[PDB]
Structure formats: structure tokens, C-alpha cells
């Protein structure tokens, strides 16, 4: 959900849970974690 969790944030992720303000930033890398380490929640 890269486009989701990003600047230009809008959605329950933003208001409910998590959207840091718009400042010049980088991004996160790809991997497996549910089946490379589940029941984990937002806010």
C-alpha cells in the first residue's frame, strides 16, 4: 500500500492512524514479513 501510506495522504490511515506532515522524504523497501519472520493492527 505504498501509494496509500505516503505524502498526499488521505484515508483512515491519515486521520485515524498515521500521516506525518508533508516534508521532503524517502521511502521504504520491499520484503516478506508475515511469512518471513499476522494479527497486527493500525491505531
Amino acid at each position: 500500500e505504498v501509494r496509500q501510506i505516503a505524502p498526499g495522504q488521505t484515508g483512515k490511515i491519515a486521520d485515524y492512524n498515521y500521516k506525518l506532515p508533508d516534508d521532503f522524504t524517502g521511502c521504504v523497501i520491499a520484503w516478506n514479513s508475515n511469512n518471513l519472520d499476522y494479527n497486527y493492527l493500525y491505531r
Partner: protein
């Protein structure tokens, strides 16, 4: 066309059920504020691409 209503763009704006909610010209927030002369909406279905 629609009229003779009262709107609440809120449940659509927040309930992300509307998936690819990408918009133009307006703030999808201020949508639950502004008022319009009249509205039109076309609907359809297409492939996943």
C-alpha cells in the same frame, strides 16, 4: 442527474470502500462543505487495467 436531496460525502470520504478515490479540482475534504448548482454522474465497469 440528481437534485432534491441532502448529501453527506463523509461516509464515502472516510470509509475507504471507494478505493481509487483520486480527485481533481476540489478538496475531497471540502466536498462535505461546498454546495453545487447541479450534479451528473456516469457509471460503468471495465477490466482491472
Amino acid at each position: 442527474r440528481i437534485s432534491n436531496c441532502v448529501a453527506d460525502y463523509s461516509v464515502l470520504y472516510n470509509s475507504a470502500s471507494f478505493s481509487t478515490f483520486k480527485c481533481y479540482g476540489v478538496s475531497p475534504t471540502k466536498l462535505n462543505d461546498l454546495c453545487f448548482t447541479n450534479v451528473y454522474a456516469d457509471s460503468f465497469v471495465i477490466r482491472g487495467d
